[PDB]
Swiss-Prot record:
<dbReference type="GO" id="GO:0043025">
    <property type="term" value="C:neuronal cell body"/>
</dbReference>
<dbReference type="GO" id="GO:0042987">
    <property type="term" value="P:amyloid precursor protein catabolic process"/>
</dbReference>
<protein>
    <recommendedName>
        <fullName>Beta-secretase 1</fullName>
        <ecNumber>3.4.23.46</ecNumber>
    </recommendedName>
</protein>
<dbReference type="GO" id="GO:0019899">
    <property type="term" value="F:enzyme binding"/>
</dbReference>
<dbReference type="GO" id="GO:0098686">
    <property type="term" value="C:hippocampal mossy fiber to CA3 synapse"/>
</dbReference>
<feature type="modified residue" description="N6-acetyllysine">
    <location>
        <position position="68"/>
    </location>
</feature>
<feature type="disulfide bond">
    <location>
        <begin position="208"/>
        <end position="373"/>
    </location>
</feature>
<dbReference type="GO" id="GO:0055037">
    <property type="term" value="C:recycling endosome"/>
</dbReference>
<feature type="topological domain" description="Extracellular">
    <location>
        <begin position="1"/>
        <end position="376"/>
    </location>
</feature>
<dbReference type="GO" id="GO:1904646">
    <property type="term" value="P:cellular response to amyloid-beta"/>
</dbReference>
<dbReference type="GO" id="GO:0001540">
    <property type="term" value="F:amyloid-beta binding"/>
</dbReference>
<dbReference type="GO" id="GO:0005771">
    <property type="term" value="C:multivesicular body"/>
</dbReference>
<keyword id="KW-0256">Endoplasmic reticulum</keyword>
<feature type="modified residue" description="N6-acetyllysine">
    <location>
        <position position="205"/>
    </location>
</feature>
<dbReference type="GO" id="GO:0030424">
    <property type="term" value="C:axon"/>
</dbReference>
<dbReference type="GO" id="GO:1990000">
    <property type="term" value="P:amyloid fibril formation"/>
</dbReference>
<keyword id="KW-0472">Membrane</keyword>
């Protein structure tokens, strides 16, 4: 019955992917950001310049106040509000209704995005990182506990954008080839271990601990691939060298300035492919996913009146570990198999196209001492 969830996501480039949900009785409709990088379900519940609608608790007969406050500070944005529970459904999802914790957002600072078309956030990660603390049961935990929905979901994020969130399973029509699984190292974020990095087939040759300093996570709520300082520097250097045929503004590599070319003349060939090797399921075994420049050069609307193709560099520096964001997940089908504590990757049905190259998930590879790549 997964076909009813195919294509249930929409979004705008750089502004996340959202799914339709209803809260309360009678049902109030809201679009909700899909975020594997957090664990709170929260919705606008007071007027805001960027909100066209919001959760009105007074109009819901099934609303219950938990008489406790809550705030969540993300890397950039933050909000605060009041905890409660209500009934929640996903129209293009499983045919169930659950009573879930809901944070009613009453104040926010750079959380809501102008024109994003979503009014709330669905944190799909584990209770360990829920605010105010891990006693606030996350939505998916409530869903599994209260229904017969299997304990897993999958995300097909496609490159004005669309995709699928399959709740409770895997839809085999959404990917090609084999699924490759990497262990979830710890159940807080969706934390994984990267064991090797190559750019155009050349090993970066860093201590693999550097790749996961101080963690590596899969985060649909983040746009970019974000890399620890040392890794970011090595990668930009390598990517500069590969594209040195053309010179770019120093602010381009910082994600500040965008670069444009005549429509249809974008020199994809001069930008390298990036391979991330992930810890596999058996001893000394890994697999790789390969990322094309069509993923890490994010398309942005022309700043001028002209119709050129302009892009932003969607790889940026992190101080909190590697973040495999939307531009990594795009073109892959990603299975969050909570039941078996693993994350699967396969080439998506909406995979990224290049003339002479292709995004791939490939294995098996042999990699010794993968345990040493984890940071402690
Ligand atoms: C929540 C806790 C566990 C405390 C936490 C703290 C720090 C880092 C993390 C890791 N995950 C974070 C990384 S970043 O802050 C985006 C965030 C979700 C989020 C919060 C926001 F405000 C906005 N605007 C948002 O919209 C993005 C954006 F690109 F920014 F427009 C869009 F693309 F989705 F639209 C997305 C993730 O959740 C978790």
């Amino acid at each position: 019955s997964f076909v009813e969830m195919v294509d249930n996501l929409r979004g705008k480039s750089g502004q996340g992917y959202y799914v339709e949900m209803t809260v309360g009785s009678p049902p109030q409709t809201l679009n909700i950001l899909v975020d594997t990088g957090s664990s709170n379900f929260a919705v606008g519940a007071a007027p805001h310049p960027f909100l066209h609608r919001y959760y009105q608790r007074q109009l819901s007969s099934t609303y219950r106040d938990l008489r406790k406050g809550v705030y969540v500070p993300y890397t950039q944005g933050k909000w605060e509000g009041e905890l409660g529970t209500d009934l929640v459904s996903i129209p293009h999802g499983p045919n169930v209704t659950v009573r879930a914790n809901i944070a009613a957002i009453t104040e926010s600072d750079k959380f809501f995005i102008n024109g994003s078309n979503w009014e709330g956030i669905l944190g799909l990660a584990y209770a360990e990182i829920a605010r105010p603390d891990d006693s606030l049961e996350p939505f998916f935990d409530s869903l599994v506990k209260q229904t017969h929905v299997p304990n897993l979901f999958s995300l097909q994020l496609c490159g004005s954008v669309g995709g699928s969130m399959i709740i409770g399973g895997i839809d085999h029509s959404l990917y090609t080839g084999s699924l490759w699984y990497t262990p979830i190292r710890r159940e807080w974020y969706y934390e994984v271990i990267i064991v090797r990095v190559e750019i155009n087939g050349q090993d970066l040759k860093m201590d693999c601990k550097e790749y996961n300093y101080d963690k590596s996570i899969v985060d649909s709520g983040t746009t970019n691939l974000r890399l620890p300082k040392k890794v970011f520097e090595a990668a930009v250097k390598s990517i500069k060298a590969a594209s040195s045929t053309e010179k770019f503004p120093d602010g381009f590599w910082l994600g500040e300035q965008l670069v444009c070319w005549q429509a249809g003349t974008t020199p994809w060939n001069i930008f390298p492919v990036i391979s991330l090797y992930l810890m596999g399921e058996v001893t000394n075994q890994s697999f790789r996913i390969t990322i094309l420049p069509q993923q890490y050069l994010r398309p942005v609307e022309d700043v001028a009146t002209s119709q050129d193709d302009c892009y932003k560099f969607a790889i940026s520096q992190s101080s909190t570990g590697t973040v495999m964001g939307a531009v990594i997940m795009e073109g892959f089908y990603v299975v969050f198999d909570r039941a078996r504590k693993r994350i699967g990757f396969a080439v998506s049905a909406c995979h990224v196209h290049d003339e002479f190259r292709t995004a791939a998930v490939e294995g098996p590879f042999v990699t010794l001492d993968m345990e040493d790549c984890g940071y402690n």
